[PDB]
Amino acid sequence: PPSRVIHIRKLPIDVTEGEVISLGLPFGKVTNLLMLKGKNQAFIEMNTEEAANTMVNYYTSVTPVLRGQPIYIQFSNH
């Protein structure tokens, strides 16, 4: 189901907090963030689930890329 928080995998090794935040900015306010640099993943929480919808939809047509490397994004169990 669509949820506020979006799980993110295959992130670069030195990926800055800033960069993961700048992923959902085009679609709304980012309210919270947990990075797992140990598994190269992160979580990102948006104000509205509806922003998290426009998120995944867009990044299903446009590759979600952080500095030349693409990443894999998906909804979560929030």
Partner: peptide, 13 residues
């Protein structure tokens, strides 16, 4: 830490 999240969250917000 949760430190660097929040400061960077705040910069934007």
């Amino acid at each position: 830490n949760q430190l660097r999240a929040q400061x960077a969250l705040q910069x934007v917000n």
